[PDB]
Amino acid sequence: PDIPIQYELANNIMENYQKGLIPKVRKGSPINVTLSLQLYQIIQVNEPQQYLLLNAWAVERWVDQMLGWDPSEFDNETEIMARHDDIWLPDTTLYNSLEMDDSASKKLTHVKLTTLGKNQGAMVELLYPTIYKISCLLNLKYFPFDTQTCRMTFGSWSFDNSLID
Amino acid sequence: PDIPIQYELANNIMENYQKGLIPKVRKGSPINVTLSLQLYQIIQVNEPQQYLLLNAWAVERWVDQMLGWDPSEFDNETEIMARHDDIWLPDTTLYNSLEMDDSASKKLTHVKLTTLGKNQGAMVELLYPTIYKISCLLNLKYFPFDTQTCRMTFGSWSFDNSLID
Numbered sequence: 001p002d003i004p005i006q007y008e009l010a011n012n013i014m015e016n017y018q019k020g021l022i023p024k025v026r027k028g029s030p031i032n033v034t035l036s037l038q039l040y041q042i043i044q045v046n047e048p049q050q051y052l053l054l055n056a057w058a059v060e061r062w063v064d065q066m067l068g069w070d071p072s073e074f075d076n077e078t079e080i081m082a083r084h085d086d087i088w089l090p091d092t093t094l095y096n097s098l099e100m101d102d103s104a105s106k107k108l109t110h111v112k113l114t115t116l117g118k119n120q121g122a123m124v125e126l127l128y129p130t131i132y133k134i135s136c137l138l139n140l141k142y143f144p145f146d147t148q149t150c151r152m153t154f155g156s157w158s159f160d161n162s163l164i165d
Numbered sequence: 166p167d168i169p170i171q172y173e174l175a176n177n178i179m180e181n182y183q184k185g186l187i188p189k190v191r192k193g194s195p196i197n198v199t200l201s202l203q204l205y206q207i208i209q210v211n212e213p214q215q216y217l218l219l220n221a222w223a224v225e226r227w228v229d230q231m232l233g234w235d236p237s238e239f240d241n242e243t244e245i246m247a248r249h250d251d252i253w254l255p256d257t258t259l260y261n262s263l264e265m266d267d268s269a270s271k272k273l274t275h276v277k278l279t280t281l282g283k284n285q286g287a288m289v290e291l292l293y294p295t296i297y298k299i300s301c302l303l304n305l306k307y308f309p310f311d312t313q314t315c316r317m318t319f320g321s322w323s324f325d326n327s328l329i330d
């Protein structure tokens with residue numbers, strides 16, 4: 001009726017979902033997470049304090065094996081937009097971060113769900129801006145003609161290879 | 166069916182669980198918490214302010230006597246990953262901390278549960294990065310040839326020996 005089609009689609013896939021548990025049903029393979037980084041601005045290079053302040057655009061993609069649906073049943077609907085707090089999210093971490101509060105470094109609002117089939121799961125896309133404060137060891141031997149290299153390490157803090165890759 | 170085995174495992178052990186109460190059933194012995202510390206970086210040594218800024222990796226391990234299960238009933242499942250806010254956590258404190266807000270010094274996301282038997286409980290593993298700001302009394306008698314010793318005290322603020330060891 002007047003209820004949008006996306007309303008019953010969300011009710012259908014969120015019925016038995018439990019966002020506190022890892023959403024994988026297959027035998028023993030992990031959940032593959034793909035990370036993409038875009039650099040937008042180098043805000044600051046603090047030499048006396050030796051940290052780098054970066055503005056980047058982050059994109060994460062993975063397959064949620066519990067959120068698939070058949071488009072033919074929902075008006076040929078293939079995508080749906082949902083809040084990031086309603087589903088399971090990987091705990092991607094910056095190992096050498098100088099900021100512990102993720103509220104001051106990230107802005108997560110919504111996720112995009114694209115069905116792969118009723119039992120195939122749905123591909124999840126996560127987009128968000130970030131401001132990373134990373135520790136950098138600066139070699140000022142050739143100052144002021146020096147070249148610096150900054151390394152950012154990303155990974156999961158609690159999940160090993162058998163769970164998240 | 167299509168529901169992952171870990172879904173009904175969580176429903177089984179979280180049925181009567183109450184995370185607001187200490188999870189011990191034995192006669193009078195306390196809960197033994199083992200703490201492990203790894204130093205990753207000395208961020209700063211503020212001499213005029215006399216505090217030390219440390220980047221450490223913390224591991225906490227204890228047995229939850231209410232969260233045991235029999236693996237034979239759940240597809241030989243022995244581990245499970247859960248959110249840290251779903252179970253009881255010890256109130257480990259840094260006595261000489263200069264920062265009261267734990268959001269700015271810690272990053273707790275998930276815990277690992279390993280069954281010890283149906284009525285034996287489960288071993289809980291807690292991993293998280295920290296940035297400790299500890300007050301240090303600096304003795305600059307031999308400056309700039311001085312050696313400094315920094316002490317960090319850890320314990321529970323509200324639980325005594327008979328509860329948490």
Ligand SMILES: *[C@@H]1O[C@H](CO)[C@@H](O[C@@H]2O[C@H](CO)[C@@H](O)[C@H](O)[C@H]2NC(C)=O)[C@H](O)[C@H]1NC(C)=O
Pocket residue numbers: 029030031032
């Ligand atoms: C995640 O990535 C792994 C690669 O490490 C994928 O494993 C492949 O699986 C296909 C079958 O779907 C095989 O044909 C390939 O030979 C495998 N590659 C390797 C290197 O093992 C896995 O399928 C991906 N998807 C998951 C785990 O859900």
Ligand SMILES: *[C@@H]1O[C@H](CO)[C@@H](O[C@@H]2O[C@H](CO)[C@@H](O)[C@H](O)[C@H]2NC(C)=O)[C@H](O)[C@H]1NC(C)=O
Pocket residue numbers: 194195196197
């Ligand atoms: C926590 O640690 C205490 C040690 O302080 C453990 O007490 C031991 O218990 C075993 C039996 O399981 C005895 O054989 C040992 O002699 C005890 N040692 C001491 C020093 O009393 C206790 O079992 C551990 N586990 C708890 C309390 O759950």
Ligand SMILES: *[C@@H]1O[C@H](CO)[C@@H](O)[C@H](O)[C@H]1NC(C)=O
Pocket residue numbers: 072074075076
């Ligand atoms: C898409 O689904 C709608 C709803 O049933 C249907 O009317 C339409 O023919 C479908 N189109 C394609 C290309 O599948």
Ligand SMILES: *[C@@H]1O[C@H](CO)[C@@H](O)[C@H](O)[C@H]1NC(C)=O
Pocket residue numbers: 236237239240241242
């Ligand atoms: C592990 O549990 C599964 C589930 O019943 C069973 O099929 C398998 O034989 C068990 N293996 C061992 C080594 O216990």
